[PDB]
Structure 1
């Protein structure tokens, strides 16, 4: 959280992907403004994204499975 993002690296496996997979996560909530999964606890968007990470909730695949159902469910709406 405020002090530590080490447990956030024993989840993914990479210090640099954490800079990417949280930024891809928080950009759906910075200006995309979606619902967060953890409660807020009066924190900015970068802190709820890392608190999301520790319980195994936002991965590289979970950032893409969440969109790929959402892509075709949007692409079953245009026609």
Structure 2
């Protein structure tokens, strides 16, 4: 559940970047393909995003690392499927 986002503001200390990081993550869960890193209590993708932020496993650096890993996986998939 969710009442305040205060710990998520503590771990991403800008309070304006929290919205952007959790929005990037909640778009990775909504359309999205991806599955959450945290157990869901029938919370929506907003609260699951912020709840991932509070326990310190999603920030901007982890999302860019995962997207570089997916870009390398697509690169290896294209190279190993064609050649």
* TM-score (normalizing by structure 2): 0.89
Structure 1 stretches of 5 or more lacking a match?
A: none
Larger Cα Rg: Structure 1 or Structure 2?
2
Q: Which consecutive residues of structure 2, in runs of 5 or more, have no partner in the other structure?
A: none
The count of residues paired between Structure 1 and Structure 2 equals 79
Following TM superposition, the consecutive aligned residue runs of length 4 or more in structure 1 with deviations greater than 6 angstroms are none
Q: CA RMSD in A?
A: 1.0
| Structure 1 residue 5 displacement after superposition | 0.4
Q: How many angstroms does 1:73 deviate by?
A: 1.4
Greater share of helix:
2
TM-score (norm 1): 0.93
Q: Which residue of 2 aligns with 1:72?
A: 72
